[PDB]
Design a protein around this motif. Structure first.
Motif, PDB file in Angstrom:
ATOM      1  N   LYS A  55       0.767  -1.312  -0.066  1.00 47.66           N
ATOM      2  CA  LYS A  55      -0.005  -0.188  -0.082  1.00 47.66           C
ATOM      3  C   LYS A  55       0.847   1.131   0.040  1.00 47.66           C
ATOM      4  O   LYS A  55       0.482   2.307  -0.462  1.00 47.66           O
ATOM      5  N   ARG A  56       1.994   1.363   0.457  1.00 49.30           N
ATOM      6  CA  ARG A  56       3.045   2.301   0.493  1.00 49.30           C
ATOM      7  C   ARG A  56       3.858   2.569  -0.587  1.00 49.30           C
ATOM      8  O   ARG A  56       4.624   3.346  -0.998  1.00 49.30           O
ATOM      9  N   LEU A  57       4.091   1.457  -1.380  1.00 47.30           N
ATOM     10  CA  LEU A  57       5.047   1.456  -2.388  1.00 47.30           C
ATOM     11  C   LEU A  57       4.631   2.341  -3.651  1.00 47.30           C
ATOM     12  O   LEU A  57       3.363   2.270  -3.888  1.00 47.30           O
ATOM     13  N   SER A  58       5.261   3.192  -3.941  1.00 46.75           N
ATOM     14  CA  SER A  58       5.237   4.037  -5.364  1.00 46.75           C
ATOM     15  C   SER A  58       4.750   3.492  -6.256  1.00 46.75           C
ATOM     16  O   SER A  58       5.495   2.309  -6.878  1.00 46.75           O
ATOM     17  N   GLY A  59       3.475   3.465  -6.830  1.00 49.53           N
ATOM     18  CA  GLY A  59       2.907   2.862  -7.868  1.00 49.53           C
ATOM     19  C   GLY A  59       2.128   1.944  -7.665  1.00 49.53           C
ATOM     20  O   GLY A  59       1.040   1.794  -8.452  1.00 49.53           O
ATOM     21  N   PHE A  60       2.200   1.524  -6.516  1.00 47.77           N
ATOM     22  CA  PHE A  60       1.351   0.218  -6.236  1.00 47.77           C
ATOM     23  C   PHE A  60      -0.241   0.257  -6.130  1.00 47.77           C
ATOM     24  O   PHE A  60      -0.997  -0.420  -6.870  1.00 47.77           O
ATOM     25  N   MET A  61      -0.578   1.408  -5.269  1.00 49.29           N
ATOM     26  CA  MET A  61      -1.916   1.742  -5.277  1.00 49.29           C
ATOM     27  C   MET A  61      -2.812   2.272  -6.515  1.00 49.29           C
ATOM     28  O   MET A  61      -3.888   2.501  -6.793  1.00 49.29           O
ATOM     29  N   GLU A  62      -1.756   2.638  -7.491  1.00 49.79           N
ATOM     30  CA  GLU A  62      -2.103   2.880  -8.670  1.00 49.79           C
ATOM     31  C   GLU A  62      -2.588   1.867  -9.805  1.00 49.79           C
ATOM     32  O   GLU A  62      -3.401   1.946 -10.757  1.00 49.79           O
ATOM     33  N   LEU A  63      -2.213   0.586  -9.281  1.00 54.04           N
ATOM     34  CA  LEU A  63      -2.673  -0.408 -10.187  1.00 54.04           C
ATOM     35  C   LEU A  63      -4.290  -0.927  -9.775  1.00 54.04           C
ATOM     36  O   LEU A  63      -4.619  -0.539  -8.895  1.00 54.04           O
ATOM     37  N   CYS A  64      -4.903  -1.707 -10.661  1.00 55.02           N
ATOM     38  CA  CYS A  64      -6.406  -1.782 -10.675  1.00 55.02           C
ATOM     39  C   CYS A  64      -6.315  -2.909  -9.356  1.00 55.02           C
ATOM     40  O   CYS A  64      -5.741  -3.590  -8.939  1.00 55.02           O
ATOM     41  N   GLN A  65      -7.396  -2.685  -8.555  1.00 58.68           N
ATOM     42  CA  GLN A  65      -7.701  -3.610  -7.463  1.00 58.68           C
ATOM     43  C   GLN A  65      -7.412  -5.051  -7.667  1.00 58.68           C
ATOM     44  O   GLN A  65      -6.860  -5.854  -7.102  1.00 58.68           O
ATOM     45  N   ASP A 101      -5.312  -6.389  -9.899  1.00 56.37           N
ATOM     46  CA  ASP A 101      -3.992  -6.677 -10.044  1.00 56.37           C
ATOM     47  C   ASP A 101      -3.067  -6.472  -8.421  1.00 56.37           C
ATOM     48  O   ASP A 101      -2.140  -7.169  -8.358  1.00 56.37           O
ATOM     49  N   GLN A 102      -3.640  -5.781  -7.941  1.00 52.59           N
ATOM     50  CA  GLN A 102      -3.139  -5.460  -6.377  1.00 52.59           C
ATOM     51  C   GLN A 102      -3.399  -6.878  -5.839  1.00 52.59           C
ATOM     52  O   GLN A 102      -2.244  -7.238  -5.082  1.00 52.59           O
ATOM     53  N   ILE A 103      -4.329  -7.524  -5.679  1.00 52.86           N
ATOM     54  CA  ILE A 103      -4.735  -8.717  -5.274  1.00 52.86           C
ATOM     55  C   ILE A 103      -4.091 -10.009  -5.578  1.00 52.86           C
ATOM     56  O   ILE A 103      -3.554 -10.668  -5.017  1.00 52.86           O
ATOM     57  N   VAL A 104      -3.910  -9.928  -6.974  1.00 51.07           N
ATOM     58  CA  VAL A 104      -3.043 -10.936  -7.813  1.00 51.07           C
ATOM     59  C   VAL A 104      -1.293 -10.686  -7.274  1.00 51.07           C
ATOM     60  O   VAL A 104      -0.978 -11.895  -6.903  1.00 51.07           O
ATOM     61  N   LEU A 105      -0.824  -9.574  -7.154  1.00 51.14           N
ATOM     62  CA  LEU A 105       0.600  -9.515  -6.965  1.00 51.14           C
ATOM     63  C   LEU A 105       0.680  -9.836  -5.409  1.00 51.14           C
ATOM     64  O   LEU A 105       1.653 -10.271  -4.867  1.00 51.14           O
ATOM     65  N   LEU A 106      -0.269  -9.412  -4.512  1.00 50.68           N
ATOM     66  CA  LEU A 106      -0.180  -9.806  -3.077  1.00 50.68           C
ATOM     67  C   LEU A 106      -0.673 -11.289  -2.952  1.00 50.68           C
ATOM     68  O   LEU A 106       0.190 -11.774  -2.011  1.00 50.68           O
ATOM     69  N   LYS A 107      -1.447 -11.927  -3.633  1.00 49.94           N
ATOM     70  CA  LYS A 107      -1.760 -13.141  -3.128  1.00 49.94           C
ATOM     71  C   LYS A 107      -0.493 -14.262  -3.475  1.00 49.94           C
ATOM     72  O   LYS A 107      -0.050 -15.219  -2.660  1.00 49.94           O
ATOM     73  N   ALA A 108       0.386 -13.898  -4.807  1.00 48.90           N
ATOM     74  CA  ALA A 108       1.344 -14.643  -5.239  1.00 48.90           C
ATOM     75  C   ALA A 108       2.934 -14.108  -4.410  1.00 48.90           C
ATOM     76  O   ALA A 108       3.668 -15.264  -4.215  1.00 48.90           O
ATOM     77  N   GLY A 109       2.910 -12.857  -4.015  1.00 47.30           N
ATOM     78  CA  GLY A 109       4.149 -12.247  -3.645  1.00 47.30           C
ATOM     79  C   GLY A 109       4.324 -12.036  -1.927  1.00 47.30           C
ATOM     80  O   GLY A 109       5.434 -12.025  -1.720  1.00 47.30           O
ATOM     81  N   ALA A 110       3.170 -11.962  -1.334  1.00 49.67           N
ATOM     82  CA  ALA A 110       3.334 -12.017   0.186  1.00 49.67           C
ATOM     83  C   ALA A 110       4.169 -12.810   0.891  1.00 49.67           C
ATOM     84  O   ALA A 110       5.148 -12.567   1.659  1.00 49.67           O
ATOM     85  N   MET A 111       3.863 -14.206   0.686  1.00 48.95           N
ATOM     86  CA  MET A 111       4.948 -15.091   1.300  1.00 48.95           C
ATOM     87  C   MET A 111       6.182 -15.002   0.743  1.00 48.95           C
ATOM     88  O   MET A 111       7.120 -15.340   1.720  1.00 48.95           O
ATOM     89  N   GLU A 112       6.379 -14.735  -0.529  1.00 51.05           N
ATOM     90  CA  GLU A 112       7.855 -14.803  -0.977  1.00 51.05           C
ATOM     91  C   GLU A 112       8.689 -13.499  -0.147  1.00 51.05           C
ATOM     92  O   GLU A 112       9.545 -13.788   0.032  1.00 51.05           O
ATOM     93  N   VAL A 113       7.599 -12.332  -0.052  1.00 51.56           N
ATOM     94  CA  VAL A 113       8.553 -11.074   0.591  1.00 51.56           C
ATOM     95  C   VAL A 113       8.863 -11.272   1.953  1.00 51.56           C
ATOM     96  O   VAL A 113       9.778 -11.197   2.724  1.00 51.56           O
ATOM     97  N   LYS A 131      -1.307  -6.161 -17.521  1.00 53.96           N
ATOM     98  CA  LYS A 131       0.119  -6.575 -17.405  1.00 53.96           C
ATOM     99  C   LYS A 131       1.105  -5.584 -17.885  1.00 53.96           C
ATOM    100  O   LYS A 131       2.343  -5.597 -17.283  1.00 53.96           O
ATOM    101  N   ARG A 132       0.941  -4.653 -18.928  1.00 55.82           N
ATOM    102  CA  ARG A 132       1.652  -3.563 -19.124  1.00 55.82           C
ATOM    103  C   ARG A 132       1.890  -2.355 -18.122  1.00 55.82           C
ATOM    104  O   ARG A 132       3.055  -1.929 -18.112  1.00 55.82           O
ATOM    105  N   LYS A 133       0.837  -1.795 -17.288  1.00 56.76           N
ATOM    106  CA  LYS A 133       1.080  -1.217 -16.108  1.00 56.76           C
ATOM    107  C   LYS A 133       2.193  -1.817 -15.073  1.00 56.76           C
ATOM    108  O   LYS A 133       2.918  -0.975 -14.846  1.00 56.76           O
ATOM    109  N   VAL A 134       1.995  -2.881 -14.712  1.00 57.43           N
ATOM    110  CA  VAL A 134       2.954  -3.638 -13.847  1.00 57.43           C
ATOM    111  C   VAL A 134       4.571  -4.058 -14.537  1.00 57.43           C
ATOM    112  O   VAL A 134       5.207  -3.731 -13.829  1.00 57.43           O
TER     113      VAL A 134
END
Ligand SMILES: CC(C)CC[C@@H](O)[C@@H](C)[C@H]1CC[C@H]2[C@@H]3CC=C4C[C@@H](O)CC[C@]4(C)[C@H]3CC[C@]12C
Lengths: 10, 243
Positions: B72-82, B84-96, B172-175
């Protein structure tokens, strides 16, 4: 459900 | 993006990370001498599988919440559509979290900070998934070998999260554009600090994907055994991500 609510929060 | 833009994306990512990092490096470094006794280790090894899974799921969920706050604090993140926000967090949160673990991992005696003290793998033996735990310790051991700074972690984890390859992305282009700027940010900082030598040492990928699939595979086995523990006592956020 829960993540959607986290993202929308103030 | 110009160079001025990526120079200042660096400080901005590092700020976002510093604010959401959860556990201060200073505390973790200081608490390295604080190691569970053989008796405490035994006490953990005497827990039921399901009590241990529940404990672990709660702690991981708690960690993931900081990761969502980071995103939510990352520059650019909250600019993605909801979506893609959820797709990115569902996949990458454990990774992080898996990357963030290297701070909380002491390579001198192979211990991780867990519930107020440092402990080895054996601490988690009740879980019934030693291959996965073993591989999670190894991963942290490799990352620890690189002597990752806080700024490197911030920059690196922002890239782990912003991944234009994740399946299910509508934009996919915005991310892709965001990923590019964060990559530039990451490599610019390494260049400025004389640390490009590590790019070739970074963990391969999938690799993080492997770990995360193993986690879900293992959960899936546990759920088949203790389906009501999961329904009744695993945090909602966790079941959403991994169930
Ligand atoms: C089902 C398996 C994925 C469980 C893995 C588990 O056997 C063990 C290695 C996990 C369980 C909870 C995890 C911790 C949860 C929270 C944190 C704080 C965070 O800043 C970094 C990682 C750290 C310190 C995690 C390190 C890895 C731990 C200790």
């Amino acid at each position: 459900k829960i993540l959607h609510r986290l993202l929308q929060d103030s | 993006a110009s160079l001025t833009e990526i120079e200042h994306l660096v400080q901005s990512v590092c700020k976002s990370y510093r604010e959401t990092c959860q556990l201060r490096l200073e505390d973790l470094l200081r608490q390295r001498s604080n190691i569970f006794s053989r008796e405490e280790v035994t006490g953990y090894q005497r827990k039921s599988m399901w009590e241990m899974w529940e404990r672990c799921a709660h702690h991981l969920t708690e960690a993931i919440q900081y990761v969502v706050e980071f995103a939510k604090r990352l520059s650019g993140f909250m600019e993605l559509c909801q979506n893609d926000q959820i797709v990115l967090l569902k996949a990458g949160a454990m990774e992080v979290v898996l990357v963030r673990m290297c701070r909380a991992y002491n390579a001198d005696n192979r211990t991780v900070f867990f519930e107020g003290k440092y402990g080895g793998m054996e601490l988690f033996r009740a879980l019934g998934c030693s291959e996965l735990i073993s591989s999670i310790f190894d991963f942290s051991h490799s990352l620890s070998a690189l002597h990752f700074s806080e700024d490197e972690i911030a920059l690196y984890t922002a890239l782990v999260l912003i991944n234009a390859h994740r399946p299910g992305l509508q934009e996919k282009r915005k991310v892709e554009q965001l990923q590019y700027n964060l990559e530039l940010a990451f490599h610019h900082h390494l260049c400025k600090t004389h640390r490009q030598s590590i790019l070739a040492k970074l963990p391969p990928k999938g690799k993080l994907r492997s770990l995360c699939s193993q986690h879900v595979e293992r959960l899936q086995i546990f759920q088949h055994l203790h389906p009501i523990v999961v329904q009744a006592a695993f945090p909602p956020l966790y079941k959403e991500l991994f169930s």
